[PDB]
Enzyme design. Structure first.
Site, mmCIF file in Angstrom:
data_model
loop_
_atom_site.group_PDB
_atom_site.id
_atom_site.type_symbol
_atom_site.label_atom_id
_atom_site.label_comp_id
_atom_site.label_asym_id
_atom_site.label_seq_id
_atom_site.Cartn_x
_atom_site.Cartn_y
_atom_site.Cartn_z
ATOM 1 N N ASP A 180 0.841 -1.184 0.000
ATOM 2 C CA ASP A 180 0.000 0.000 0.000
ATOM 3 C C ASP A 180 0.887 1.248 0.000
ATOM 4 O O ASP A 180 0.634 2.204 -0.736
ATOM 5 C CB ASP A 180 -0.931 -0.027 1.224
ATOM 6 C CG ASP A 180 -2.008 -1.119 1.124
ATOM 7 O OD1 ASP A 180 -2.777 -1.100 0.140
ATOM 8 O OD2 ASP A 180 -2.094 -1.993 2.018
ATOM 9 N N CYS A 214 1.158 0.970 -14.450
ATOM 10 C CA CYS A 214 0.677 0.891 -13.073
ATOM 11 C C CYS A 214 -0.461 1.910 -13.173
ATOM 12 O O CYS A 214 -1.389 1.714 -13.973
ATOM 13 C CB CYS A 214 1.765 1.309 -12.072
ATOM 14 S SG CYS A 214 2.939 2.525 -12.679
ATOM 15 N N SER A 215 -0.407 3.003 -12.416
ATOM 16 C CA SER A 215 -1.467 3.991 -12.540
ATOM 17 C C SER A 215 -1.033 5.134 -13.466
ATOM 18 O O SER A 215 -1.753 5.487 -14.408
ATOM 19 C CB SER A 215 -1.872 4.535 -11.170
ATOM 20 O OG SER A 215 -3.089 5.238 -11.296
ATOM 21 N N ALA A 216 0.132 5.718 -13.202
ATOM 22 C CA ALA A 216 0.643 6.795 -14.060
ATOM 23 C C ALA A 216 1.652 6.228 -15.092
ATOM 24 O O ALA A 216 2.061 6.925 -16.028
ATOM 25 C CB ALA A 216 1.312 7.901 -13.207
ATOM 26 N N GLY A 217 2.050 4.968 -14.896
ATOM 27 C CA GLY A 217 2.990 4.326 -15.794
ATOM 28 C C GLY A 217 4.371 4.952 -15.783
ATOM 29 O O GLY A 217 4.999 5.086 -16.836
ATOM 30 N N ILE A 218 4.846 5.343 -14.600
ATOM 31 C CA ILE A 218 6.171 5.942 -14.478
ATOM 32 C C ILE A 218 6.913 5.478 -13.231
ATOM 33 O O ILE A 218 8.131 5.287 -13.261
ATOM 34 C CB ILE A 218 6.130 7.512 -14.468
ATOM 35 C CG1 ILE A 218 5.298 8.031 -13.292
ATOM 36 C CG2 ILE A 218 5.555 8.036 -15.778
ATOM 37 C CD1 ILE A 218 5.447 9.543 -13.041
ATOM 38 N N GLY A 219 6.180 5.292 -12.136
ATOM 39 C CA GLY A 219 6.814 4.873 -10.895
ATOM 40 C C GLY A 219 7.193 3.406 -10.867
ATOM 41 O O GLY A 219 8.350 3.047 -11.127
ATOM 42 N N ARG A 220 6.217 2.557 -10.553
ATOM 43 C CA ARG A 220 6.457 1.126 -10.478
ATOM 44 C C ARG A 220 6.868 0.590 -11.845
ATOM 45 O O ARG A 220 7.631 -0.360 -11.949
ATOM 46 C CB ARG A 220 5.193 0.406 -9.998
ATOM 47 C CG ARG A 220 4.619 0.956 -8.695
ATOM 48 C CD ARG A 220 3.379 0.187 -8.266
ATOM 49 N NE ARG A 220 2.696 0.860 -7.161
ATOM 50 C CZ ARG A 220 1.481 0.548 -6.707
ATOM 51 N NH1 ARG A 220 0.779 -0.446 -7.249
ATOM 52 N NH2 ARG A 220 0.961 1.259 -5.710
ATOM 53 N N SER A 221 6.348 1.204 -12.894
ATOM 54 C CA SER A 221 6.656 0.780 -14.238
ATOM 55 C C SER A 221 8.131 1.035 -14.502
ATOM 56 O O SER A 221 8.813 0.235 -15.154
ATOM 57 C CB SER A 221 5.798 1.565 -15.221
ATOM 58 O OG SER A 221 4.435 1.203 -15.088
ATOM 59 N N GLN A 261 9.584 7.416 -9.274
ATOM 60 C CA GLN A 261 9.067 8.608 -8.591
ATOM 61 C C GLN A 261 9.544 8.928 -7.169
ATOM 62 O O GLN A 261 9.357 10.049 -6.692
ATOM 63 C CB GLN A 261 7.537 8.576 -8.618
ATOM 64 C CG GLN A 261 6.959 9.245 -9.845
ATOM 65 C CD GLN A 261 7.321 10.715 -9.887
ATOM 66 O OE1 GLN A 261 6.917 11.486 -9.015
ATOM 67 N NE2 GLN A 261 8.094 11.112 -10.891
HETATM 68 C C1 LIG Z 1 -2.148 15.188 -10.119
HETATM 69 C C2 LIG Z 1 -1.577 13.968 -9.399
HETATM 70 O O1 LIG Z 1 -2.145 13.488 -8.418
HETATM 71 N N1 LIG Z 1 -0.422 13.503 -9.950
HETATM 72 C C3 LIG Z 1 0.255 12.334 -9.375
HETATM 73 C C4 LIG Z 1 0.281 11.188 -10.447
HETATM 74 C C5 LIG Z 1 0.946 9.908 -9.922
HETATM 75 C C6 LIG Z 1 2.283 9.644 -10.327
HETATM 76 C C7 LIG Z 1 2.961 8.506 -9.872
HETATM 77 C C8 LIG Z 1 2.347 7.542 -8.974
HETATM 78 N N2 LIG Z 1 3.150 6.444 -8.585
HETATM 79 C C9 LIG Z 1 3.414 5.401 -9.529
HETATM 80 O O2 LIG Z 1 4.193 4.478 -9.314
HETATM 81 C C10 LIG Z 1 2.727 5.355 -10.905
HETATM 82 O O3 LIG Z 1 1.579 5.017 -11.051
HETATM 83 O O4 LIG Z 1 3.503 5.735 -11.934
HETATM 84 C C11 LIG Z 1 3.771 6.477 -7.272
HETATM 85 C C12 LIG Z 1 4.455 7.689 -6.902
HETATM 86 C C13 LIG Z 1 5.096 7.866 -5.671
HETATM 87 C C14 LIG Z 1 5.090 6.840 -4.724
HETATM 88 C C15 LIG Z 1 4.444 5.637 -5.019
HETATM 89 C C16 LIG Z 1 3.781 5.412 -6.261
HETATM 90 C C17 LIG Z 1 3.163 4.060 -6.366
HETATM 91 O O5 LIG Z 1 2.025 3.895 -7.066
HETATM 92 O O6 LIG Z 1 3.690 3.121 -5.836
HETATM 93 C C18 LIG Z 1 0.985 7.774 -8.544
HETATM 94 C C19 LIG Z 1 0.325 6.853 -7.652
HETATM 95 C C20 LIG Z 1 -1.018 7.090 -7.231
HETATM 96 C C21 LIG Z 1 -1.717 8.244 -7.685
HETATM 97 C C22 LIG Z 1 -1.081 9.169 -8.566
HETATM 98 C C23 LIG Z 1 0.274 8.960 -9.014
HETATM 99 C C24 LIG Z 1 1.680 12.661 -8.843
HETATM 100 O O7 LIG Z 1 2.128 12.018 -7.900
HETATM 101 N N3 LIG Z 1 2.361 13.660 -9.484
HETATM 102 C C25 LIG Z 1 3.725 14.051 -9.076
HETATM 103 C C26 LIG Z 1 4.738 14.342 -10.236
HETATM 104 C C27 LIG Z 1 5.150 13.157 -11.133
HETATM 105 C C28 LIG Z 1 5.159 13.314 -12.697
HETATM 106 C C29 LIG Z 1 6.336 13.936 -13.500
HETATM 107 O O8 LIG Z 1 7.556 14.130 -12.746
HETATM 108 C C30 LIG Z 1 8.676 14.802 -13.354
HETATM 109 C C31 LIG Z 1 8.587 15.426 -14.652
HETATM 110 C C32 LIG Z 1 9.697 16.086 -15.243
HETATM 111 C C33 LIG Z 1 9.548 16.680 -16.538
HETATM 112 C C34 LIG Z 1 10.658 17.343 -17.143
HETATM 113 C C35 LIG Z 1 11.913 17.419 -16.463
HETATM 114 C C36 LIG Z 1 12.079 16.831 -15.168
HETATM 115 C C37 LIG Z 1 10.967 16.153 -14.544
HETATM 116 C C38 LIG Z 1 11.083 15.543 -13.256
HETATM 117 C C39 LIG Z 1 9.956 14.874 -12.669
HETATM 118 C C40 LIG Z 1 10.150 14.270 -11.358
HETATM 119 O O9 LIG Z 1 9.617 14.699 -10.379
HETATM 120 O O10 LIG Z 1 10.961 13.208 -11.315
#
Ligand SMILES: CC(=O)N[C@@H](Cc1ccc(N(C(=O)C(=O)O)c2ccccc2C(=O)O)c2ccccc12)C(=O)NCCCCCOc1cc2ccccc2cc1C(=O)O
Length: 282
Positions: A180, A214-221, A261
């Site tokens: 979680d 995953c959800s945003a396709g950047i963290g766990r992915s 992330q």
């Molecule tokens: C509006 C809103 O709520 N947005 C959320 C969207 C989101 C992202 C990742 C998750 N995740 C994943 O694994 C996933 O699903 O992927 C997790 C994130 C943290 C911890 C755990 C988890 C998890 O699910 O385990 C989410 C999980 C749940 C809900 C929302 C989750 C958020 O958090 N945004 C922050 C910025 C990240 C987005 C670009 O960063 C950048 C862009 C750049 C662009 C240009 C240059 C440098 C840049 C640098 C960065 C940077 O910060 O590195």
């Protein structure tokens, strides 16, 4: 090396600092197509978009947009399509992408519901007798069977192009036990998950790139792709310890923003790789 580096960084609480260095160094490219008003409802998070240069295009003429990036690793010779968990209105697009890109496998690292809210639409059928039809992309999906295990589930699916009546089998690799909060204490089960994905031949060249999300396709992915690529690179080099994981992450970030992330995911990544290399040679 990377082995001792893990030591230093770890026993120094240096993780948070490094991650930030990565964030600071990461590439920055234009996501013009992603920010177009007509695509507002094709994106799950307003702050998570695909760079235009590496976005995946749908072969339809209406709107070819989908939140998905093609990570093309030249040295490791491996490609991945990282995408966001589909939205109620992008499931058809999602499966259209899988078909057109000739992907063989779909890798899912989250649950439909996590923390009381939806993190991804139920884009696949849960019962063999209840198939799904995506009318907008003219695709049919059927649950042929599944194999439920401790920390992950593999499903065999039949995706069919209703237009041409052509059928194709797709393997759904669903990691169902990601915690979680934070990351797994041990990368063991995650490593076994990756290997199972490798064994299927879904990561191989005779198929289209795998679709990871995953959800945003950047963290766990990100951790999934990163670990796979780093391991593979260690198989190709004379000196396996020369593989610089930060360097690799930064290379992947040229294709999609945000990969990995949190510092935790970065640490976890180091771990899975390190431990993965050990397991392969015994
Ligand atoms: C509006 C809103 O709520 N947005 C959320 C969207 C989101 C992202 C990742 C998750 N995740 C994943 O694994 C996933 O699903 O992927 C997790 C994130 C943290 C911890 C755990 C988890 C998890 O699910 O385990 C989410 C999980 C749940 C809900 C929302 C989750 C958020 O958090 N945004 C922050 C910025 C990240 C987005 C670009 O960063 C950048 C862009 C750049 C662009 C240009 C240059 C440098 C840049 C640098 C960065 C940077 O910060 O590195």
């Amino acid at each position: 090396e990377m082995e001792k580096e893990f030591e230093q960084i770890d026993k120094s609480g240096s993780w948070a600092a490094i991650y930030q260095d990565i964030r600071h160094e990461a590439s920055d490219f234009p996501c013009r197509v992603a920010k177009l008003p007509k695509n507002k409802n094709r994106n799950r998070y307003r702050d998570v978009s695909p760079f235009d240069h590496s976005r995946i295009k749908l072969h339809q003429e209406d709107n070819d947009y989908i939140n998905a990036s093609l990570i093309k690793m030249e040295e490791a010779q491996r490609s991945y399509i990282l995408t966001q968990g589909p939205l109620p209105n992008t499931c058809g697009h999602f499966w259209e992408m899988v078909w057109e890109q000739k992907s063989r496998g779909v890798v899912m690292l989250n649950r439909v519901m996590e923390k009381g809210s939806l993190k991804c639409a139920q884009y696949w059928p849960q019962k063999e007798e209840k198939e799904m039809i995506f009318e907008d992309t003219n695709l049919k999906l059927t649950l042929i069977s599944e194999d439920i295990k401790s920390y992950y589930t593999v499903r065999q699916l039949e995706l069919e192009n209703l237009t041409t009546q052509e059928t194709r089998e797709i393997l759904h690799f669903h990691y169902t036990t990601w915690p979680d909060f934070g990351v797994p204490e041990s990368p063991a089960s995650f490593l076994n998950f990756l290997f199972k994905v490798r064994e299927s031949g879904s990561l191989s060249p005779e198929h289209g790139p795998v679709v990871v999300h995953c959800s945003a396709g950047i963290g766990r992915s990100g951790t999934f792709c990163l670990a796979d690529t780093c391991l593979l690179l260690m198989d190709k080099r004379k000196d396996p310890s020369s593989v610089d994981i930060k360097k690799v992450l930064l290379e992947m970030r040229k294709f999609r923003m945000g990969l990995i992330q949190t510092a935790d995911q970065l640490r976890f990544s180091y771990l899975a790789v390190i431990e993965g290399a050990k397991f392969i040679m015994g």
